[PDB]
Amino acid sequence: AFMPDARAYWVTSDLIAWNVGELEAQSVCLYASRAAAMSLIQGYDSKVELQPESAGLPETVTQKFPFISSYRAFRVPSSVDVASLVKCQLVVASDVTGLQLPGVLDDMFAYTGPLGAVFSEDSVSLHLWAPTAQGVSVCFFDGPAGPALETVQLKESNGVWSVTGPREWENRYYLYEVDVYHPTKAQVLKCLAGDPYARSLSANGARTWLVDINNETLKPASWDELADEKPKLDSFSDITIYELHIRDFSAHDGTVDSDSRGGFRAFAYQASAGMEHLRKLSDAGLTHVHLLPSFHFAGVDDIKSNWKFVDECELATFPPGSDMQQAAVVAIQEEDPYNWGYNPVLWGVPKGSYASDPDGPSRIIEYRQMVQALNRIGLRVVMDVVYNHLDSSGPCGISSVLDKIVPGYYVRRDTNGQIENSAAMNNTASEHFMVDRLIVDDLLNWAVNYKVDGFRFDLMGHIMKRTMMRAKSALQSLTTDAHGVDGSKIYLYGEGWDFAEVARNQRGINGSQLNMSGTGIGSFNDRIRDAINGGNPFGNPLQQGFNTGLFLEPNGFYQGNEADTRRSLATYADQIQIGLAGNLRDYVLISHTGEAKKGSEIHTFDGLPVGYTASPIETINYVSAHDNETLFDVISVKTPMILSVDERCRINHLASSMMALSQGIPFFHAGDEILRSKSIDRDSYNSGDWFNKLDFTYETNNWGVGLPPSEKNEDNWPLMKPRLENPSFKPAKGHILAALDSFVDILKIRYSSPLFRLSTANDIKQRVRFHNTGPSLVPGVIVMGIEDARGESPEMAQLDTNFSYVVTVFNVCPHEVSMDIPALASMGFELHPVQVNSSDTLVRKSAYEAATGRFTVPGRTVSVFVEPRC
Ligand SMILES: OC[C@H]1O[C@H](O)[C@H](O)[C@@H](O)[C@@H]1O
Ligand SMILES: [Ca+2]
Ligand SMILES: [Cl-]
């Protein structure tokens, strides 16, 4: 009907911004209608002329909203009751358009008092920030399915709606009824919404459970003593991360009771094959498990009686390169138990589908029991937090909450008023005060109420840097005496990708890789990933890299002439070595041309620095993650088809060892260690248990279970089919167990010397040297030396009581190499004791010759040499 866009901005109590011309600016008015009854302006309750502000927009405004800094400014007269107007339908007219209100809403209504439910001895109170709402009431219910028992009116003060009732309100269910103007419908609508500050929910978040999160009955045995029982963490430099999905972990695990597979409770089965696996990794030195999204997300029904399943017996009979398996999975993929969970509804509540019973307390106590179980086998717990976007927006539908209550505020919008979608639809606006508040409050909820040990930030580049830093400070100031957790050990990292509307700091300084340099917050190092694997997950799948045969073992995909592939290989080796040295801006490497270059002076294909950090703790080194192809699958695609699976097994080990022996923080995708496959699925978020299988019997790796789902993969099916059909590509249990044994040993090696985990940039610059460099380097070999104090009157602290020097040779060549390093001649090097005793017969052949400083290393092998002190 009347359905304006919103090209103007109400930025402060007294200023409106609108990009009109000078003559147009001489007659602008503001029109309001409480009933949203305006027509094309007619049908308004009030009008006021806006006098152009020749001074323009002040610094506070242009700093907060850089993308509108050139807009003309208009002064709102003191006669205007702003609090009343922001509840109405508004337009400005010169041309007619609506107003984007977040600036003025923060300016007038930013609030730091209590939100959500507050309990006291004799009362329960509710508080909701909804400054644009015309009315707010609460509907109470006595259970998850009953009818409403009563409706209570809330009263507004300074933008916040509140009501206090008796203690007996505890454990009721409730919803807010919010009467508010929704721009997408140009109407004032009555919306039923859960509490943004919810701490529990009925199934699918249908109602909010008015639970006291501090109730004794929600605490597992010994919960309050957990801080004392937590694994020691001396330094962030000691962190290694293992990235795991909660359903993947136990969906197929026959050692877990059938009715307890797929959720939080599976982690309480201490003797299960899955928990024995995690214990094996932790004992070897793994410190942290990063769990995929585990808060209230859309895309899986919490009501288990609605779950559908493929006939996994029938699908097993289909050919390994058939498209029938994926067709069957896809036919029910919206009704199965499976999703990665990157679809946020309410951040502060555990996912009901992972609980035994989605109504009542089980989701809370079982989440706590999971954290406690992981901690008790020596693993700290990281949550994958998704603050950059929402599942849904608008007035309707069970999965929209924040945007029902304060429409157009929690979500970021373009200059026409339309919601921004670059972060997987319905991008949030952390630049707005109460969004930033909710993000920080949520982090503190998980840290305090669930004793979570760290956080991985999905699309961190879409979050304001100021939000990241305020969160970091608040988290790291938590103490055991005041809060029950040692905040000083809580670690933060994320995806610092810079793209779309947040690029060039257009919405403020965002959490990009470059902007987070010097913050102590980690970001994923895509440079080392791509240099090792080759190309980029969105480039040609056959593009080779340092560890997939570029130059050394061409795969038949044309990638240039021999001189060019040789140089491209050497260029990738430069990028890898910067990454192995913590991916630092200032680390100086002899590059492939012979020229000494800082990490920042070695560039990406887009001219950005390869090395971008100020500290090794800012670097998350990885070759694999839940996104894109698994390590095994990328290797199987890019290497020559003729390689044996035995050869590919060694190549997998090389990749994970480059991570495990790097400076910075190594990150492993669950399954790296056991050759995990998704049958080459590049984006398995909705591909079910069939394509995402984690087999802790080690009988299968899930290679050859059909072409993966067509939506994301069909364009690449022709390269996939002959590989999936070829029996020589599929590993057996022996290979899987061999991969696991060597992964365990390389972790033992990392944790055998503090020299692999240097804590500062200065230490790395002083101690880490690369020895196969320049135009005449031996292709396919990286030699990395790490020095400790030795002799009398040393110029560095002694960090290692067992070893005075470590040298690592990564040999990706399919043949033995002899690397002569005169600088390391006449020293006491011997093969690392772990490798002397390796179950791999080949690595045992590695040798050092003192007279020449010659390190002889077999094909496709990582060899670690130590100089003992005793
Ligand atoms: O698709 C996103 C990709 O775009 C470009 O290829 C960039 O080089 C790469 O860094 C980024 O990941
Ligand atoms: Ca699904
Ligand atoms: Cl077939």
| Domain edges within the chain | 1-107, 108-212, 213-792, 793-870
For 518, 589, 614, 615, the CA distances from 600, given in Å and listed in that order, are: 14, 11, 11, 13
Cβ atoms 652, 739 nearer than 8 A:
yes
- Report how far apart, in Å, the C-alpha atoms of 858 and of each of 282, 328, 379, 643 are: 29, 45, 34, 17
End-to-end CA distance of the chain: give it in Å, rounded.
85
Level-2 CATH architecture, domain 1-107: Sandwich (2.60)
Q: Is the CB of 538 under 6 A from ligand 1?
A: yes
Residue nearest (by alpha carbon) to ligand 1 atom 9: 536
Ligand 1: residue whose CA is nearest its atom 1: 538
Helix (H, G, I), strand (E, B) or coil at 516: coil
Q: CB under 8 Å to 553, separation ≥6 — which residues?
A: 639, 640, 643, 814
Q: How far is CA 99 from CA 33, 36, 50, 409, 417, in A?
A: 13, 14, 14, 12, 8
Q: 326: CA distance to ligand 3 center in Å?
A: 12
Q: In what order do the strands lie in the sheet with 781-787?
A: 768-770, 781-787, 803-811, 861-868, 830-831
User: Is the distance from CB of 429 to CB of 435 less than 8 angstroms?
Assistant: yes
Closest ligand by atom to 334 CA? 2
**What token pair was written down for 119?**
């309990």
The residue nearest atom 3 of ligand 1, judged by CA position, is 538
Q: Ligand 3 mean position to 718 CA, how many Å?
A: 12
User: Which residues are catalytically annotated?
Assistant: 458, 495
> What CATH code would you report for 108-212?
2.60.40.10
**Which ligand 1 atom is the nearest neighbour of the CA of 539?**
6
Ligand 1 centroid–CA 173 distance in Å is 46
β-bridge partners, 506: 508
Residue 9: burial class (beta carbons within 10 Å; 0-12, 13-18, 19+) = buried
Calpha distance 136→190 (Å, rounded): 9
Please choose from 538, 612, 683 the residue to mutate so as to test ligand 1's pocket, defined by most ligand atoms within 8 A of CB: 538
| Residue partners of 3: CB distance under 8 A and separation at least 6 | 186
Angle value at C-alpha 392, between 387 and 397, nearest 5 degrees = 140
Chain breaks in the chain (C to N over 2.5 A) after: 40, 94
Beta bridge partners of 75: 15, 51
For the CA of 538, the nearest ligand: 1
Question: Which ligand number lies closest to the CA of residue 336?
Answer: 2
Task: Please report, for residues 591, 622, 633, the alpha-carbon distance to residue 629 in angstroms, rounded to integers and kept in the order given.
Answer: 30, 13, 6
Resolution (A): 1.6
- In this structure, the strands spanning 46-53 and 344-350 are unpaired
Residue 606 Cβ contacting ligand 1 at under 6 Å: yes
Query: How is residue 305 written in tokens?
Result: 């009686």
Tell me if 287 sits within 8 A of 240, measured CB to CB.
yes
CA distance 697 to 272: 11
| C-alpha 527 – ligand 1 centre gap (Å) | 11
Q: Decide: residue 640, CB within 10 A, 0-12 exposed, 13-18 middle, 19+ buried.
A: middle
Helix (H, G, I), strand (E, B) or coil at 635: helix
How would you classify the pairing of strands 89-93 and 46-53?
A: unpaired
CA of 165 to the centre of ligand 2 (A): 41
- Please enumerate, by residue number, every residue annotated as part of a binding site for Ca(2+): 282, 286, 333, 336, 338, 378, 686
Ligand 1 and 536: CB distance under 6 A = yes
Binding residues: 282, 286, 333, 336, 338, 378, 686
Inter-residue contact 857 to 817 (CB < 8 Å): yes
Pairing of strands 160-166, 155-157: antiparallel
Q: Which atom of ligand 1 is nearest to the CA of 604?
A: 8
Q: Do domains 108-212 and 213-792 have the same CATH topology?
A: no
Strands 665-669 and 861-868: unpaired
Atom 2, ligand 1: residue with shortest CA distance: 538
Ligand 1 geometric centre to CA of 386 (Å):
21
| Distance from Cα 725 to the centre of ligand 3, integer Å | 8
Q: DSSP letter string over 337-401?
A: S------EEEEEEE-GGGSS-SSSTHHHHHHHHHHHHHHHTT-EEEEEE--SB-S--SSSSTT--
* Calpha distance 844→853 (Å, rounded): 18
Q: Is 415 in the pocket of ligand 1 (CB under 6 A)?
A: no
- Quick one: fold of 213-792? TIM Barrel (3.20.20)
Contact predicate 124/118, CB 8 Å: yes
Instruction: Give the residue whose CA is nearest to atom 4 of ligand 1.
Output: 538
Q: Which atom of ligand 1 is nearest to the CA of 497?
A: 12
Q: Per DSSP, which regions of 569-722 are E strands?
A: 588-590, 596-598, 619-621, 665-669
| CA of residue 71 to ligand 2 center, whole Å | 45
Q: Which ligand is nearest to the CA of 721?
A: 3
Around ion ligand 2, which residues have CB less than 5 A away?
A: 333, 336, 338-339, 686
Strand partners, 178: 136, 191
Gap between the Cα atoms of 450 and 432, Å rounded: 27
The answer to whether 867 and 826 are in contact (CB under 8 A) is no
Question: Does ligand 1 have an atom closer than 6 angstroms to the CB of 605?
Answer: yes
**Phi, psi dihedral angles at 488 (to 5 degrees):** -65, -20
| Ligand nearest the Cα atom of residue 604 | 1
CA–CA distance, 548 with 552 (Å, rounded to integer): 9
Ligand 1 atom with least separation from CA of 526? 10
**C-alpha span between 743 and 16 (Å, rounded):** 60
Q: Which atom of ligand 1 is nearest to the CA of 499?
A: 2
CATH code for residues 793-870: 2.60.40.1180
Three-state DSSP state, 296 = strand
CA–CA dist 700, 691 (Å, integer): 12
Q: Where are the alpha helices (DSSP H) in 518-677?
A: 526-533, 562-580, 631-638, 645-660
List residues, by chain if needed, whose CB lies under 5 Å from ion ligand 3: 319, 322
